[PDB]
Write a protein that binds this ligand. Structure first.
Ligand code: HEM
Length: 179
């Protein structure tokens, strides 16, 4: 189960974060303990949208999702996801009880720290923190590392995705925002 009420960044700039571009997960911290992951976040016809990509570089398990985000407060969202192929074709429809929360704890032009809590079926899932960068496999800079510290988290405990053989379809993620 999830246990954290993540606090959103003071002065979070939603237009900057939800600008339609891609964010790569570079490091993650599972509170209830290996995929590569990335997302696009943007607006489509006035709605906040995210497209997600997960890839397991060992098993090859791959899946995409599209979500409309509902606002709880600035920088804190609830998202109902639908599983899609890379083209946006629906594989699993939206269903009540299948959702994640998403909190942006820190963001700037190139980096972010987020918290997410996934609810899926009758699985018992836990909190996940992720460091994001606009550039694939970029080493975490001083600003986001300081934000990790300021959140009372130990960055050395995070797991890096940067050494995995992952490729990302940026074009697909961006186009999924409209789906
Ligand atoms: C490297 C970071 C991440 C890892 C290692 C990871 C791992 C996983 C795993 C193993 C699953 C399968 C769960 C199951 O069905 O048993 C999953 C599903 C999911 N994750 Fe992540 N995840 C990561 C990042 C994220 C992020 C940042 C988000 C949201 C912004 C997210 C949202 C989701 C959603 C919505 C599903 C269910 C998708 C579906 O069934 O259609 N994940 N993740």
């Amino acid at each position: 189960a999830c246990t954290k009420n993540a606090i959103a960044q003071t002065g979070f700039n939603k237009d900057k974060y939800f600008n339609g571009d891609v964010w790569y997960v570079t490091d993650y911290l599972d509170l209830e303990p290996r995929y590569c992951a990335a997302l696009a976040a943007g607006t489509a016809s006035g709605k906040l949208k995210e497209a997600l990509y997960h890839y397991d570089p060992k098993t090859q398990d791959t899946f995409y999702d599209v979500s409309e985000l509902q606002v709880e407060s600035l920088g804190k969202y609830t998202a109902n996801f639908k599983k899609v192929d890379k083209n946006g074709n629906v594989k699993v429809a939206v269903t009540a009880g299948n959702y994640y929360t998403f909190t942006v704890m820190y963001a700037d032009d190139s980096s972010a720290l987020i918290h997410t809590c996934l609810h899926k079926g009758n699985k018992d899932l836990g909190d996940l923190y992720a460091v994001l960068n606009r550039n694939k496999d970029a080493a975490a800079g001083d600003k986001v590392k300081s934000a990790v510290s300021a959140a009372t988290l130990e960055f050395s405990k995070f797991i890096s995705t940067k050494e995995n053989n992952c490729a990302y379809d940026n074009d697909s993620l961006k186009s999924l925002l409209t789906k």
